[PDB]
Amino acid sequence: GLNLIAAHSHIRGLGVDADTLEPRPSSQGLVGQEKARKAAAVVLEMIKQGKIAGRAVLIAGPPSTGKTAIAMGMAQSLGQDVPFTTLAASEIFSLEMSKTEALTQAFRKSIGVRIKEESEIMEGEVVEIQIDRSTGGAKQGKLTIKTTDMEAIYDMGSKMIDAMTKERVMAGDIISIDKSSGKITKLGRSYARSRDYDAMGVDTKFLQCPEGELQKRKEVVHTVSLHEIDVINSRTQGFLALFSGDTGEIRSEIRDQINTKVAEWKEEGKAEIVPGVLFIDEVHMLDIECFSYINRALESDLAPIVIMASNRGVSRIRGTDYKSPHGLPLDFLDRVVIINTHPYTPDELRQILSIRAQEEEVDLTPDALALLTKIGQEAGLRYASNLITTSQLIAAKRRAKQVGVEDVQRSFKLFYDPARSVRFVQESEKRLIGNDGVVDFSY
């Protein structure tokens, strides 16, 4: 389909026992990180219960130790039933709006309002339409429609005749009508009428006739975030700004009205509130002004849970000239708990490479897997996973059925790992452009 194989495609969840939250050594695509996966499992319980507002959790660890993997696992284990917002900290630096506006919007995307609405919907195959136009049109008309179980004629009101003529409804069309509003959606064409569709090209698909009652009270569940209600209320077609993105700095009195309105809907039972989670990857790319904002945005009943990932050691905080753990100010780290991820052992590297090799279409000989595991220990898990794809393509070019050691060795030779590439720049130092801008082009 459209969804190609990405770096995280093998992650289907957290791999955790729902009863005890004990992580299994491998499941759902996650290997090891058990203490970290247990802690991420405790955070899901908090998210799903909704009781607690504005906890901030930091996932701290070296690069390529599964900080994003665990973040993908949580998203997959919440599923579509909860707002999950994934923010790269680089995105907050909009030109359309201030940083704190962008952080408010991100927080507001992560609280959902869940609303349940019924409609009667009428669905069936059209047996007939007749319309009498006299000559101004739409003077009267009759619809005959059926399922496999029922058939009916309807006398049509003139605006339904306009809807029918707009959507060019003809005999054999399978249509649905949202009769509370009168939009027609043409679900398809009946196979039993295929010869009538003389204009439809051979690529045309045909459906079977619908079934059961012609009319059903379908119930729809909507979730709309607080940010969507804010943007709707910003201008005459404000909802369009949910797509073009040209929301200005939406005025805070609009948001306060909406916060009041939603608390009203909660007490009346007209709506339910669904606290989601905001994930901020590379939280160290935020600056000191962002952190002092987030401090107080967390202290609100309409705050999501926030989850953050950092690779950084004791490092300079952006927007200041001093250094702090994770690159984050201690004022902020006081309101955070840290989950730390460790480096993998070789048997975990083997399993992760195997899962990555099964997610990709790669038949891998045992010695190639052993070799890739050695490379993983020495060059890093990402480099070895990148070599899987390469060796498959090399094996394929020589028409081989399996990736052998021979193919991994071509890959290792053709594509340098980070450490080999660092040596290359150190040995090539006069030929590369140095930090002083000096370079020599001569042989």
Partner 1 sequence: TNIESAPSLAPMKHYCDVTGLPAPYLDPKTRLRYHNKEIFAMIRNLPQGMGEQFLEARGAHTV
Ligand X SMILES: Nc1ncnc2c1ncn2[C@@H]1O[C@H](COP(=O)(O)OP(=O)(O)O)[C@@H](O)[C@H]1O
For the chain, give the number of residues. 443
What does the block give as tokens for 387? 């070599």
Kindly list the distances between the CA atom of residue 71 and the CA atoms of 164, 256, 406, in Å, as whole numbers in the listed order.
48, 31, 36
- Of positions 98, 154, 272, 386, contacts partner 1 by CB under 8 A: 154
355 binds partner 1 (CB under 8 A): no
Query: Is position 23 an interface residue for ligand X (rule: CB under 6 A)?
Result: no
Burial 171-182 (b: 16+ CB within 10 A, else e): ebbbbbbeeeee
77 known ligand binder: no
Interacting span for partner 1 (CB under 8 A) from 65-73, 150-158, 266-274, 408-416: 150-158
Cβ-based neighbours of 418, under 8 Å, separated by 6 or more: 379, 380, 383
> Residue 12 or 146: which CB sits closer to partner 1?
146
**Residue 212 within binding range of partner 1, rule CB under 8 A:** yes
Cα separation of the two ends of the chain = 50
Range in contact with ligand X (rule: CB under 6 A) among 27-35, 108-116, 190-198, 256-264: 27-35
> In which region does residue 118 sit, left (phi positive, over 0), alpha (psi from -120 to 50) or beta (all else)?
beta
Out of ligand X, partner 1, none, which partner does residue 352 contact, by CB within 5 to 8 A per kind? ligand X
Nearer to ligand X, 9 or 98 (CB): 9
Round the CA-based radius of gyration of the chain to a whole number and report it. 29
In the region spanning residues 385 to 414, those forming contacts with partner 1, defined by CB under 8 A, are: none
285 is an interface residue for ligand X by CB under 6 A: no
Which 364-423 positions form the footprint of ligand X (CB under 6 A)?
A: 381-382
Task: Calculate the CA 302 to chain-centre distance.
Answer: 22
Q: Print the binding letters for residues 340-369 with ligand X: x by CB under 6 A, - otherwise.
A: ------------x-----------------
CB under 8 A: which stretch of 130-138, 148-156, 180-188, 341-349 binds partner 1?
A: 148-156
Q: What are phi and psi of 263, to 5 degrees?
A: -65, -35
Determine the Cα–Cα distance for residues 102 and 434; give it in Å rounded to an integer: 37
64 is in an annotated binding site: yes
Decide if residue 63 touches ligand X (CB under 6 A). yes
Name the residue number minimizing CB distance to ligand X.
66
* Nearest residue (CB) to partner 1, 128 versus 429: 128
Which residue's entry shows tokens 């179980």?
Answer: 149
Nearer to partner 1, 195 or 217 (CB): 217
* Integer Cα distance of 380 and 65 in angstroms: 10
Annotated binding-site residue? 252: no
Dmax (CA) of the chain: 91
Question: What is the 8-class DSSP label of residue 395?
Answer: H
Q: What is the DSSP string of 235-248?
A: STTGGGHHHH----
- The two beta strands, 56-60 and 336-340, are parallel
Of the candidate residues 30, 60, 92, 375, the single one contacting ligand X (CB under 6 A): 30
Out of 9, 165, 215, 389, the only residue in the binding site for partner 1 (CB under 8 A) is 215
Q: Is 403 annotated as a binding residue?
A: no
Per-state percent for the chain, helix, strand, coil, to nearest 5:
40, 25, 35
Q: Is 341 labelled a binding residue?
A: no
Query: Among residues 176 and 389, whose Cβ is nearest to partner 1?
Result: 176
Q: Which residues bind partner 1 (CB under 8 A)?
A: 127, 144, 147, 149-154, 212-215
Give the annotated binding-site residues for ADP: 7-8, 10, 31, 64-69, 296, 335, 344, 382
Q: Which residues bind ligand X (CB under 6 A)?
A: 7-8, 11, 29-33, 63-69, 352, 381-382
